[PDB]
Design a protein around this ligand. Structure first.
Ligand code: 620
Length: 342
């Protein structure tokens, strides 16, 4: 029969042998395995998404994006295993490079040197430059979505919430629900934005940088609106100029109802930090999204001077472009995964 793991079938042979459990998840099970072809250990995730239209959609979205991206700092798909017919296809197995750890697990346990912080940040921005150049927003950047191997190469993963940028359709009402991870949400999400512009990823990168400096999340809101008050407590009350950019009255009047708060200077929160890192942090964590630095300007910042090399920071060859019943989604997943057969 097929090899089994923790009371579940993991039908990936013959190429992939000698499995070990390494993780459950709400999306499915991850095992490591021996690739008998390349003679390396890989990671394999088993997904069973076809009973739910929502999992089908996220699965298909991420497959199409990762198959089209090719970049050293973005996780790739090595292989996809599934049944030879649509009728027999109940599960899909995705094969990726095995990564040692992620930035979330690293920060819980390790102090980072300024050299590591700088190198990690450079790789995040280098990968983000390629992503944005393709007109895609990640929208859920956080430490657990940044994987690392044993030599500190970093790869961005988890494109399940990614969208094509759509700035003309970004506006929305006060307190509109959002799905990405609370601590790393840009303030405009809670006020007037659907998160369809590149500036929301830069905010999340600024949060990750702050978290690398201190080993703890800088804005750990308990709930939707607590998140905003954590932000203003450090950045201070927005200026009149920045309020004038918020035209929705509910959002503007909420901010006007709050007590005045002054900015807390970064160097008081992070006394050990490199002052160039704090200058870049300041420009990433700007309240007003139109004043927030873009990814190419961040790469050119003096903090990153020993790595910056635009001729070695590739952009995508063409911008990326894409209500369906699950039956059609299943058919679409079948079609996209065909190139890995037999
Ligand atoms: N790559 C890696 N190393 N350790 N863990 N880990 N990855 C989590 C993971 C492993 C293997 C395949 C994975 O892919 C999930 C995915 C789901 C849907 C579409 C495309 C890919 C994820």
């Amino acid at each position: 029969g097929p090899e089994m793991v923790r009371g579940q079938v993991f039908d990936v042979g013959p190429r992939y042998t000698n499995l070990s459990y390494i993780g459950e998840g709400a999306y499915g099970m991850v095992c490591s395995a021996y690739d008998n072809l390349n003679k390396v250990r890989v990671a394999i995730k088993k997904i069973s998404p076809f009973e739910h239209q929502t999992y089908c959609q996220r699965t298909l979205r991420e497959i199409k994006i990762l198959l089209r991206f090719r970049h050293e700092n973005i996780i790739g798909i090595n292989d996809i295993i599934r049944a030879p017919t649509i009728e027999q296809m109940k599960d899909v197995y995705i094969v990726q490079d095995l990564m040692e750890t992620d930035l979330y697990k690293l920060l819980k346990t390790q102090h980072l040197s300024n050299d590591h912080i700088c190198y990690f940040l450079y790789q995040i921005l280098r990968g983000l430059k390629y992503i944005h150049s393709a007109n895609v927003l990640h929208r859920d950047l956080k430490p657990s979505n940044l994987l690392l191997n044993t030599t500190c190469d970093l790869k961005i993963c988890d494109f399940g919430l990614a969208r094509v940028a759509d700035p003309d359709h970004d506006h929305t009402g006060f307190l509109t629900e959002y799905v990405a991870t609370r601590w790393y949400r840009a303030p405009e999400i809670m006020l007037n934005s659907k998160g369809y512009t590149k500036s929301i990823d830069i905010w999340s990168v600024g949060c990750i940088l702050a978290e690398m400096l201190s080993n703890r999340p800088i804005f750990p809101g308990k709930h939707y609106l607590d998140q905003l008050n954590h932000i203003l407590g450090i950045l201070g009350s927005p200026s009149q100029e920045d309020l004038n950019c918020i035209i929705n009255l509910k959002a503007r009047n909420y901010l006007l109802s709050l007590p005045h708060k002054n900015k807390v200077p970064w160097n008081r929160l992070f006394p050990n930090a490199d002052s160039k890192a704090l200058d870049l942090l300041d420009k990433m964590l700007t309240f007003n999204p139109h004043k927030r630095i873009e990814v190419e300007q961040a790469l050119a910042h003096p903090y990153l001077e020993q790595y910056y090399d635009p001729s070695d920071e590739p952009i995508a060859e063409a911008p990326f472009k894409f209500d369906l019943p699950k039956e059609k989604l299943k058919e679409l997943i079948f079609e996209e995964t065909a190139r890995f057969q037999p």
